[PDB]
Amino acid sequence: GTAGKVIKCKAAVLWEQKQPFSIEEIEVAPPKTKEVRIKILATGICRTDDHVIKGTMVSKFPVIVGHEATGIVESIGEGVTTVKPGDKVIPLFLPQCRECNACRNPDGNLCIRSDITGRGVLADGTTRFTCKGKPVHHFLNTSTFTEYTVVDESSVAKIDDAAPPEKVCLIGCGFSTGYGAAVKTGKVKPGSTCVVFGLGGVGLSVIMGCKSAGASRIIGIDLNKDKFEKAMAVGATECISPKDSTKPISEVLSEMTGNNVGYTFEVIGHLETMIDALASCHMNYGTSVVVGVPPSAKMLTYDPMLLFTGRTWKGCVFGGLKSRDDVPKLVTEFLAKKFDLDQLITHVLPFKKISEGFELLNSGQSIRTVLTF
Amino acid sequence: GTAGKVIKCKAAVLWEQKQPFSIEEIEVAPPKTKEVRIKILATGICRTDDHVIKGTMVSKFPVIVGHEATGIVESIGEGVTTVKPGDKVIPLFLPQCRECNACRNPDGNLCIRSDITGRGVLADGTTRFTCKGKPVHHFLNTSTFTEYTVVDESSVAKIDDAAPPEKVCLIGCGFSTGYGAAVKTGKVKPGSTCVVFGLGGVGLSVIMGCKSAGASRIIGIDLNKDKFEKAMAVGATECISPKDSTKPISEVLSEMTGNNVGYTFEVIGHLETMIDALASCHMNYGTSVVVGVPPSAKMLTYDPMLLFTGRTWKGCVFGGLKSRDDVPKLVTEFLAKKFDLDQLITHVLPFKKISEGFELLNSGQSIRTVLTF
Amino acid sequence: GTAGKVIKCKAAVLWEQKQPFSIEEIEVAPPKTKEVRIKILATGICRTDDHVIKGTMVSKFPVIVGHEATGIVESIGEGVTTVKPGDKVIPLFLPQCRECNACRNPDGNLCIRSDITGRGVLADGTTRFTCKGKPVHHFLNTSTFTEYTVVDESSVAKIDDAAPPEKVCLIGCGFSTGYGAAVKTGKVKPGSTCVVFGLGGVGLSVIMGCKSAGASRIIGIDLNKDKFEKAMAVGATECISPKDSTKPISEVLSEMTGNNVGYTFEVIGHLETMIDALASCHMNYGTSVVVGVPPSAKMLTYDPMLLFTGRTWKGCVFGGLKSRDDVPKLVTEFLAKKFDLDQLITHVLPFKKISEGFELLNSGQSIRTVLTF
Amino acid sequence: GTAGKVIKCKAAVLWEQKQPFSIEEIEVAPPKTKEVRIKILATGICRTDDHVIKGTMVSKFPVIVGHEATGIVESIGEGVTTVKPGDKVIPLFLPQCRECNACRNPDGNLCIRSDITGRGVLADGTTRFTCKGKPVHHFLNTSTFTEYTVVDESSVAKIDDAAPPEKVCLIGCGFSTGYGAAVKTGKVKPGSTCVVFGLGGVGLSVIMGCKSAGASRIIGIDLNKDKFEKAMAVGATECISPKDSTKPISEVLSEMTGNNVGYTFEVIGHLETMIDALASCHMNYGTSVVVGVPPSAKMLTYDPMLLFTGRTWKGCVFGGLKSRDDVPKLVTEFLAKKFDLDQLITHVLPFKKISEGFELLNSGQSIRTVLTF
Numbered sequence A, B, C, D: 001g002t003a004g005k006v007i008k009c010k011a012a013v014l015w016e017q018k019q020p021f022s023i024e025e026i027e028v029a030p031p032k033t034k035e036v037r038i039k040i041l042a043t044g045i046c047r048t049d050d051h052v053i054k055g056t057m058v059s060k061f062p063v064i065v066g067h068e069a070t071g072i073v074e075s076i077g078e079g080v081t082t083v084k085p086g087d088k089v090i091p092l093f094l095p096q097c098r099e100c101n102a103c104r105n106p107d108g109n110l111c112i113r114s115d116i117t118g119r120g121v122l123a124d125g126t127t128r129f130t131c132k133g134k135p136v137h138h139f140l141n142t143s144t145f146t147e148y149t150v151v152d153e154s155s156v157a158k159i160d161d162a163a164p165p166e167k168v169c170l171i172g173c174g175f176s177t178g179y180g181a182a183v184k185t186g187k188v189k190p191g192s193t194c195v196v197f198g199l200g201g202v203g204l205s206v207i208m209g210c211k212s213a214g215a216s217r218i219i220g221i222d223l224n225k226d227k228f229e230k231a232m233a234v235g236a237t238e239c240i241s242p243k244d245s246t247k248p249i250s251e252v253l254s255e256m257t258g259n260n261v262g263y264t265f266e267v268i269g270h271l272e273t274m275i276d277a278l279a280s281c282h283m284n285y286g287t288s289v290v291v292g293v294p295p296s297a298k299m300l301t302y303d304p305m306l307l308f309t310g311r312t313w314k315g316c317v318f319g320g321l322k323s324r325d326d327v328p329k330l331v332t333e334f335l336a337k338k339f340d341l342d343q344l345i346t347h348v349l350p351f352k353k354i355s356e357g358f359e360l361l362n363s364g365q366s367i368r369t370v371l372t373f
């Protein structure tokens, strides 16, 4: 059996910054106390993983990226009580220890164990991956571009057995982030007028969230007009582009709504568009939510008056969800046909084609690409 | 009688920026349509007024400042229905026309008639003051450093007749802003921890707000340790100065609280402290309210990452109050003994002694100085 | 695009009388010769619309009511020449073909195309709505509680582009009616004494008309004493309720004015108040204008002596205004700030909250609720 | 002389209703303060006088009716200043005290002193006639079927000495009623189309009034076709009878005029025809003037929708004339040859033949019958 043993399996390893993937043969250490070794069934390609490759996301090397996936528990560590071998699960980059301040607080979800600094190691401070002697790091409490991974129990979400791995894997990041961004972070209201910068997989998910929140007008923004057809079909009552006019996108949006934009979402990852989305919500009651991760070590410079007048500016992590709580529920909600993830998955390919996946994403020819094992 | 006629009286004029007050004899034209001419009984000296003098706040010159006051209606203009002569009123710098989007919005308050650009005129675009054959500008729909002033009806609140004008005048800016900032803009929850950057008149008011909201810890921060005694008398659990330690204030606060700073309030007017306040609240579930008025034409550069983690950053105008509905309620609550304003008034001087009032404000030797007529 | 195509949208339908609204998916056929398809931006809730529900206003079922609205022309049918796609417009329940007698007569305004018999169809006799494969009838040449509607060109007024939809929609009925009822129909002369029975949306507008005309005393009447505050503000000099005294309201009015009630307006819709309003004007030189709609199939029995003595009794449709001529002019006058429409609008809600709009009217809590799309 | 002495003379008296006159010897008391005793030269027989006999008009018994006449002032009471003995006058059944609201109001004419209640007394509340000991009552402030009568100075119009008393007496009721009904109450416009219900003495005068107003069409209506030739002679353009067709008269008239009946006058006295007259004027811009006196204590039931659509419905007392100002002018205009009264007088008989006059009226063999002394 594999339990207790070291599992030799393949994994898409990254040896250094700005280098292509390399599918090595690696060895996954068995789960120590309160850890869980998971066999990955399908993992999607989130734009964040690409950040590490680009170097806009802090990370130690070598590292096995990937964090959006579904899998089965191959073996539980000592002291594990939330899952047993055979259970279907979803690895949580955003954990839920249920013990820290942010966890004990209904309005907080950024668990203390959240890898926000590029630690690239588990709770005890070590790695569980080896490749050619040298140890390979973790990515955001997960690492899913591997046949097997080992995560802390606090980052394991037991989900329903009948859940399609290649679909619900979007609940591990992309979908839950955009949806929760509207529903739980900005808390969009019925009849509201929202704006969505960036029509990628998370962008399209925010639109879905707003629409499910009763927003009557949802304007989608993107440079890539090819994304519009998807946007309009997701819930966008309209879609425009910064380049369609020479006047500030803020002014345009104002004029379009007669100065009544109650919500704006930045779902790209640019600082320039963070100022844009802020400037675009109403100067006194408008709320601007930042979903896109800003590039590492970049300082923002804007006009504070835009905030003084009353605007609310907040950031978002995993759509404001409390991972271990909300994730299994969101899976149940999918099974009950409540939301369609299929609209998001533009490509389903075998793990080996990972390089193609990062070619597609980077060309705008795809929303979500699910790598299957 | 004086109704219908031009009134000749004394007003503290500011002929140009970076110049002292000049108490001239000016002419106050009678109230046109839906305008109200008020006899000023008591007016407080607010830091925002000093900004006009210092030159860090936009204004046309000459101009009559003052915007925190209690008065009596001398005469109403044609069409006025909410007040009649002899009525006790508080002129409002933040109007409430009850008809615009912000006014109609239950989460708004920055009425479209607000003089947010330093126009220095009333709704019809004209001034009611003249001195030496020259038209003197109005200040934020009010101008109270004058025996009489004329405001629009949307900028007048009828208050209880029994209200001590030399106390409830703070309800026209200082107290309402601070107290509102905590109870309304911030929505401080009971049992939480708050940090107030700035212990002047507004700062101390925010403490009263947090205290009214049930917060278990309210930490005051000021470089002037002479402010601490007062801060403690009005509810602060403890006070400290940034100069007390070399490590970042945000680190000190986090440590002092076990990483649990629920809310912070910038009640000073420095971009640097705005960022310190932002950073000092819990990265994921913390809220930071910008009460202080940023100096004219200065951009703010801060680390975006501070936001992304989930922090909520929001502006604050007049405590988030809908002026015409809330000011009378605060007066009613003052008369209901729900809070004391005496703790905020450290000096009560004749109007002619305004320059001494400004000296004490600047020298840190006074919270609120109230000028009487 | 949508031109020449069947639009699919949502509309609040009434399947039978004495039933709640049921927002359904409906199809709206493209405009035929001389018709115009309009996208609705905002629409008011008029008491007449509620009559259909109550069964006291004739209509064929199912039907889409709503008539007080502002919109933008989605497209124009063959032969149209007064509006073009993009034009902002107010749909007119009161046509103005300009050919018929009432149209050619400077004192007339009820065009032959006016729907006074519950025809619920367009000029060619057919419908443009379908729901579940079945025709749905129009209402008063308009039908605005739908995202899209088609009207005959005779029933559209091209208004100024800067006109705020959620405000100028009141010019499609409520305001123009009660305003003109005083200025145009009753031709209230300066110095007179007017009396308004009913202080709702239309009743308040009547008062503005009387005030505008020059009446010296405008007396408002309403069983709902909560409506007094606004009547007073709008122009009333005093208000009273039928209940305040046991003596017939006419006696009360005679005694208050010393038998000098020049004009009376019935802005309710009860036969009893129609008579009450009649008996209330001076028996020999008094004029009584009926603005309220009398319930269908109800005969009015009165004392002919009230009339014989010299009293003038006259009906009033849309305040006696000629639709396509006067609507564009009232919009322009609004933009010139001649009359205040926002005083009438107490609630702005999103279209989906229609039931709430009616319940508010029916509970006596609103004047006008504007539903926005 | 007779001045100051009780005058014994004859008069036609009704001892009770539904009883023919009885020429008796009566005593006419001298004129008290501000009264005038008049010698009746000529008096006309108006249908209203017959209402008293039939019982459909309210009056006390016994009584001396008649109210249409010309006479000469025998003696004036104390304080009289408008007329002197020998002066030719016309007694006014409709007074003009010049001090009540109606009298002072330019649009009023029903003076406060009018006997609208059936009192049959003078201003001071007493009678002046006596017969067989018992006092007989006055009628409509006049009483003219007597050789002598006493009216109040307010009910006395001094006319031109050169006026044919047997012709100008029509200016005491009939002519003035119908003529003014068109020109003053109805304000008939040039080129309009009028319809006159009732081709009797008052109707023919309305027709003369419509003809002077410049009407284009004047359609007369009567059950008695023998009345047509005269109607055509005074100005009618055509005449018809309700029985000429089975379809409602309103439809007939509409078809005849192409739905353009601007004015309708009811000069008969039936509630049914008052309604028929209403429904016969254009539903929106039509005006219906009620001239015929409705039978006492009879309620009128109609369809309020006839009024609602815009019809103006109004009463008429003495064709809208302010008796003391207008009667003298009508006489002067008569002597200016403006109109011809001869056409209205079909018979001139001596006072003793009163019964014949009433026989001819009730049989349709006479228009106006004048009784001479």
Ligand SMILES: NC(=O)c1ccc[n+]([C@@H]2O[C@H](COP(=O)([O-])OP(=O)(O)OC[C@H]3O[C@@H](n4cnc5c(N)ncnc54)[C@H](O)[C@@H]3O)[C@@H](O)[C@H]2O)c1
Pocket: A046, A047, A048, A051, A173, A174, A177, A197, A198, A199, A200, A201, A202, A203, A221, A222, A223, A224, A227, A242, A267, A268, A269, A270, A273, A290, A291, A292, A293, A294, A316, A317, A318, A319, A364, A367
């Ligand atoms: N906060 C989190 O919890 C969280 C979770 C998931 C993803 N993310 C972050 O969200 C962002 C996007 O997520 P994604 O997976 O949907 O990426 P994505 O690439 O699919 O979306 C990028 C979209 O933005 C559009 N875009 C790029 N530049 C633009 C510009 N200048 N103006 C308008 N549109 C522009 C692109 O055309 C594309 O449609 C990334 O920063 C990712 O790291 C954050």
Ligand SMILES: NC(=O)c1ccc[n+]([C@@H]2O[C@H](COP(=O)([O-])OP(=O)(O)OC[C@H]3O[C@@H](n4cnc5c(N)ncnc54)[C@H](O)[C@@H]3O)[C@@H](O)[C@H]2O)c1
Pocket: B046, B047, B048, B051, B173, B174, B177, B197, B198, B199, B200, B201, B202, B203, B221, B222, B223, B224, B227, B267, B268, B269, B270, B273, B290, B291, B292, B293, B294, B316, B317, B318, B319, B361, B364, B367
């Ligand atoms: N939002 C608004 O509606 C509104 C309303 C009223 C006042 N204000 C603004 O609020 C701010 C305060 O008003 P105030 O009347 O209470 O002024 P104040 O002069 O009484 O208070 C300033 C306080 O901050 C302290 N301070 C100054 N620099 C500091 C620093 N670097 N670190 C810590 N403490 C420092 C001062 O010692 C003083 O105690 C000003 O910006 C004023 O313009 C805004």
Ligand SMILES: NC(=O)c1ccc[n+]([C@@H]2O[C@H](COP(=O)([O-])OP(=O)(O)OC[C@H]3O[C@@H](n4cnc5c(N)ncnc54)[C@H](O)[C@@H]3O)[C@@H](O)[C@H]2O)c1
Pocket: C046, C047, C048, C051, C173, C174, C177, C197, C198, C199, C200, C201, C202, C203, C221, C222, C223, C224, C227, C242, C267, C268, C269, C270, C273, C290, C291, C292, C293, C294, C316, C317, C318, C319, C361, C364, C367
């Ligand atoms: N003539 C038309 O062209 C035209 C146009 C618009 C509306 N209307 C009709 O006008 C009438 C009122 O319109 P609205 O929109 O202003 O409705 P509304 O409901 O807002 O106003 C009705 C008002 O009358 C008051 N009222 C009701 N019963 C009363 C009574 N028994 N005695 C005294 N006051 C009483 C109500 O409390 C309310 O204040 C309705 O009949 C409507 O159908 C007619």
Ligand SMILES: NC(=O)c1ccc[n+]([C@@H]2O[C@H](COP(=O)([O-])OP(=O)(O)OC[C@H]3O[C@@H](n4cnc5c(N)ncnc54)[C@H](O)[C@@H]3O)[C@@H](O)[C@H]2O)c1
Pocket: D046, D047, D048, D051, D173, D174, D177, D197, D198, D199, D200, D201, D202, D203, D221, D222, D223, D224, D227, D242, D267, D268, D269, D270, D273, D290, D291, D292, D293, D294, D316, D317, D318, D319, D361, D364, D367
């Ligand atoms: N308003 C006043 O100031 C005033 C003044 C004078 C007369 N009146 C009233 O005017 C009315 C007419 O007076 P008149 O003196 O001319 O009397 P009248 O008898 O001469 O005229 C009555 C006419 O109506 C016709 N008529 C009756 N029933 C008919 C019907 N159903 N349809 C059509 N025609 C019919 C008769 O044939 C006759 O031609 C009476 O009611 C009288 O009391 C009122």
Ligand SMILES: C[As](C)(=O)[O-]
Pocket: none
């Ligand atoms: C079937 As049915 C009552 O709508 O005619």
Ligand SMILES: C[As](C)(=O)[O-]
Pocket: C060, C061, C062
């Ligand atoms: C007129 As039906 C659709 O109710 O039968």
Ligand SMILES: C[As](C)(=O)[O-]
Pocket: C016, C061
């Ligand atoms: C035609 As039916 C009375 O069923 O609505």
Ligand SMILES: C[As](C)(=O)[O-]
Pocket: C099, C100, C101, C102, C112, D258, D259, D260
């Ligand atoms: C004759 As017509 C068209 O005005 O009814």
Ligand SMILES: C[As](C)(=O)[O-]
Pocket: D232, D233, D234, D235, D236, D237
């Ligand atoms: C006598 As004629 C006016 O009908 O021609």
Ligand SMILES: [Zn+2]
Pocket: A046, A047, A048, A049, A067, A068, A173, A174
């Ligand atoms: Zn991701």
Ligand SMILES: [Zn+2]
Pocket: A095, A096, A097, A098, A099, A100, A101, A102, A103, A110, A111, A112, A113
């Ligand atoms: Zn935790």
Ligand SMILES: [Zn+2]
Pocket: A270
């Ligand atoms: Zn980009």
Ligand SMILES: [Zn+2]
Pocket: B046, B047, B048, B049, B067, B068, B173, B174
């Ligand atoms: Zn201030």
Ligand SMILES: [Zn+2]
Pocket: B095, B096, B097, B098, B099, B100, B101, B102, B103, B110, B111, B112, B113
């Ligand atoms: Zn406002």
Ligand SMILES: [Zn+2]
Pocket: B060, B135, B137
């Ligand atoms: Zn100036």
Ligand SMILES: [Zn+2]
Pocket: B268, B270
């Ligand atoms: Zn400072």
